[PDB]
Paper text:
Serine O-acetyltransferase ([name]) is an enzyme in many bacteria that catalyzes the first step in l-cysteine biosynthesis by transferring an acetyl group from acetyl coenzyme A (acetyl-CoA) to l-serine to form O-acetylserine. In this study, we used recombinant [name] cloned from Salmonella Typhimurium (StCysE).
In the first step, l-serine is converted to O-acetylserine (OAS), with acetyl coenzyme A (acetyl-CoA) used as a co-substrate, by means of the catalytic action of serine O-acetyltransferase ([name]).
Author numbering:
A (entry chain C), C (entry chain B), D (entry chain B), F (entry chain C): 5 to 261
B (entry chain A), E (entry chain A): 5 to 262
The structure:
């Protein structure tokens, strides 16, 4: 439920703003002067994406236009906040993803890019993709189709290509590629279905399925489809076992055979 | 020819300025204002390299001096733009690499650093190497010898050491290391020959040859030479097959055998 | 000794001012104007951790405060400079790590955040952790315990988690993850003992021991303990040989079998 | 009416985007993207009152808050635009004051500070007063009472003190001081009544009356009251004639005897 | 000749870089790097005009285009540098105006705005006028016609309106207004002829002639024409005497009779 | 007494930092984290004089070097704070000059420039003079000799030339020139003796004396010496009267005949 999240964040914003006098005016700015999650998200994205080419105030107008035309982006972000909080044991506050975690920021920046792309504003979407790549080291093509409840933990070196699909409740670590094959357009990127966990450094290549609740071991190179509820690992990857739960995204157990 | 790529780019820029109002001026300053590819390149490298330590306007003189001394660097950039357009299916416009792709920027920044290193301005070349590492997440030592028609797609994590060689028409993906062994000076990094494709996350270490037309599979760790027209894959890498084409850099087929 | 490293840095700085007119004032400000290593480290961290939120002038004051209270951090930095100079054949000068190398800058930033974390100022330590991840592409949790004589060569994509330990005289390359497992707090990150070399791309996951003088091969995924004076390689990693020396961190031999 | 001024501004903005490629995105961001005058005023004040201390994105929120609570400030701005357009023969367009003229920008910044001063937020009002003095070279104390239809032409070196009053339809040129006397609080600054024209460099000092339709000559130093419909000039100023019209602010005739 | 001033400047810059370490790089980038006065001017105007709205690197193209179209603007700047060096006793170096004096910067920024206005790029010229007003506190309308060998000493508060004319070898101090009357278009600002000196705070209003070799005393308010080789002073100004020299702009004698 | 001033400022800094959450981190930075007036002055000058050419951290080192070699500059600034507080009825807090008033800031910037000039660092002093002119619109040549207890109220358009002298306890308003004659070097600027008050827009030209406790009317052009305890006014200036007190700088009575 959306309002829960926002409330917690405000409480946390009070408790914390006393402690660091250095940060006081930063907390008031990012969390305390806003009345909904949407206002805060637009604030942080505006500051995060600001450039000489397009300053913060101009970006915030684009982002607010996107949130007004599609309020479900705000709800997706709330689910993404919850996913990081519940899955990442280094995060126990709802405020942390929104303030600090570049993976969370790159994810919400993609959503604006995606919206822009589906409305025909593709030149702007590509500009934002490549700026997010420079600034947060996450390169997600704005045509990719990404659900909600996604954790991009650490996030540096993530690549998601044009025709990729990432369904709800997926967990992805640093240096993961959902990448293409060939020199031609068309469907050529992975389909990552609900509940999948992808470990650090995994490279998944081509228009292949990674089925519901599968787990991909860290450092794996997946060139063939991976059935649902299965664990794949190695270079190249083979089936080595079965995950310990229904949705490995939720448990983040990195072990494989 | 240089002239075509440049004309194509100008055509694209006119269409782009008319369709996106937030970027009309950006497109005008970076592309429509200029009369040749050399002038557009110096503009984009200047801006993206810019730091408090060294501002855009100072960088631009350095870059222009380099292009006046060695205009083959502009012809090299033009081959690199064409490589990305023909080999990367996410790119349909000649202008995209020049405007947006950090791997293309890093590579043309390398060429400036290389020109400086060879002239004896090593201190400045090392500054820029490390500026490029922070700004574009590509670490290419300026003593490396890198040819043209090179694509660095996505590019985050790419490392290319001091003594590496990369010949013409090579394609390289994100998190590729062309890396060193040992604590000693002298040749210790790979020599990558023409037509080679290197998949994402591959690690190639030491003074070893990767022959013409070879393919290195994603996530591979290559410790021994790879014969021409051969496919290597695994940790550590073994010869597992032969590529489907004479120049796998052109085709970007990522598949390889068990 | 500090005095040695520092004298070498000043001599090199004098020569560099005559080598490159464009950077003479830069070498002056960063090196020639200072009386000791500590003052030049604080100057460098100030300008590199400078944000719109917190400016260079204010961060220097926090770094000076930490160096006064614990001057061993300055001596740790000096050992880190010597480590890069002696181990990295592309670095001959002592000034190079201090001026340019983002792995060296990230490692010293960590020490500031680790000090703040230990004094209970966690909001600021987590703020800096994530700043460093964005600016230098190194993500080190401040609660990690990292010794001295550490080289982080090239450095981009390094991730070190909350409960990791890195003892003295370790060499780590780009895209190395010292990473977690599970969704629970507790010991869950690697323990990297003295003398260990970790090759580019290695992923080491869970609360496991990499013992004295071990070598982890490039691209390897380590899920079980690695005994002392042993080479581990593969995905997943298994024992494949013995290092050619007692401290592979000092020799940087990437070969494995 | 607001609607008129605003429609004129948009029409001019459309033409300017085709006149100058270099500034097309600028005209778009500042004018074409907005739905009313109020939203464009807040955008302009944000980017012009932007500081390292307080960013554009945060100042816009304070300006929007003041315009919601008191929308007559927006209508005052519109009268100020018409005043410059009708009175200044070098300004034909309505967009020009809004885009470029520092006197116009300073005057609208004042209204924000004057509102803040009246709500008791004086630290912020004094902060902005001095920001405007530095950035636009206009020093207006926020407690001054300034009406609407005011032209501050060229504007550099204008000083208006704490207890000054400027009624509607006044024209003031560069280097005009509406200034104090003494070291004590209390009424000590001029009262400038409706229709008055003040020439370049005039110094008007103390709690004195410059009555309806008076003209103050350039370079004059006014120490005693000036009766309505009278011309004052000299150092010190004495009465020298009568203005050629009932509202010299509207005619801008600099001649005196 | 242009060549001398430029050589003199380069000589000065070498000495300056060796003596002040905090500014060695500044001096190198702004002066020692360049091979002619035109290139140094475009560099300094670019940097000082720079705004979030328009960055240095974009300004510099505009400026260079102007100097390529009309290189007399560089010869004009060189006469202005010489005017400041010979007439301002606080300035002994040819480099000081170019580096530091905001009145010299404002004036060369005007020349760019004037070139743009005359070409039909009026919107950009008005942008720059107002950028210069905020950054250097000098408001000079770009339709004004201003010659060369002009000194604007200190310069804060200077206002020059749309229809003003300033001929060669004129010296002007801070808070001088060459100002308008009325709400109507057409000539309404002063025409200042050759050799005129205008003291600090003088206000000169309307379409009136100030003749060759005249002197306008500090703090004066001039409402009627001033004959050649005459001294005007007062509020309002009266003819009070004759200047000590044929060209008071050269001598900068501020004295005038009761 | 110096410590008084500093104390008051800290008390004021607490009382005020509660009120404006926007400014909280700015107050902590400018006033609360410093233990003496010298540290605060160096902070504010560093931020105020920062440029791409010479960032804040580098400037602060120059300024601290100057304050260590000559601590009387810090005391002069304290007397300048007191002068503004006691003479300007719009200022009643000791913090206001230090935080906000560009006249105060330009004065203390001159002192650094003066120190630099007397040590042979003239190229740097001239760079700072011209930056202060651009940034605060006060142009003071660093060779001028300026005492303590000086008020530069409003300050925009002030010019003080190379050979000028300003003794202790002088009050100067906006647009005042202490200016030169001729094209030759040598003594050619005014000598302004103790207690003088100079009104807005006054132009004082040549190597002439303005005697102890004299008053110069606003808008006056002074080309001849002005005896002690005398009032001069007009264009050109003549003796018109005698000031109402011993030191007109203290009372700020702008009236003249």
């Amino acid at each position: 439920e959306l309002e829960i999240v926002w409330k917690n964040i405000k409480a946390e914003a009070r408790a914390l703003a006393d402690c660091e006098p250095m940060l006081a005016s930063f907390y008031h700015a990012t969390l305390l002067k806003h009345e909904n999650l949407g206002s805060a998200l637009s604030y942080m994205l505006a500051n995060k994406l600001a450039s000489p080419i397009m300053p913060a105030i101009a970006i915030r107008e684009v982002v607010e236009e996107a949130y007004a035309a599609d309020p479900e982006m705000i709800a997706s972000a709330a689910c993404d906040i919850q996913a990081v909080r519940t899955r990442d044991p280094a995060v126990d506050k709802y405020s942390t993803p929104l303030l600090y975690l570049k993976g969370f920021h790159a994810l919400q920046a993609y959503r604006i890019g995606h919206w822009l792309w589906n409305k025909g504003r593709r030149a702007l979407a590509i500009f934002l993709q490549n700026q997010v790549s420079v600034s947060f080291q996450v390169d997600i093509h704005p045509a990719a189709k990404i659900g909600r409840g996604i954790m991009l933990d650490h996030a540096t070196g993530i690549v998601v290509g044009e025709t990729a699909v990432i369904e709800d409740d997926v967990s992805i670590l640093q240096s993961v590629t959902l990448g293409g094959t060939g020199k031609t357009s068309g469907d050529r990127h992975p389909k990552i279905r609900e509940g999948v966990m992808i470990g650090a450094g995994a490279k998944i290549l081509g228009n292949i399925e990674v089925g519901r609740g599968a787990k991909i071991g860290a450092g794996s190179v997946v060139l063939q489809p991976v059935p649902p509820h299965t664990t794949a690992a190695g270079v190249p990857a083979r089936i080595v076992g079965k995950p310990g739960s229904d949705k490995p995204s939720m448990d983040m157990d990195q072990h494989f055979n």
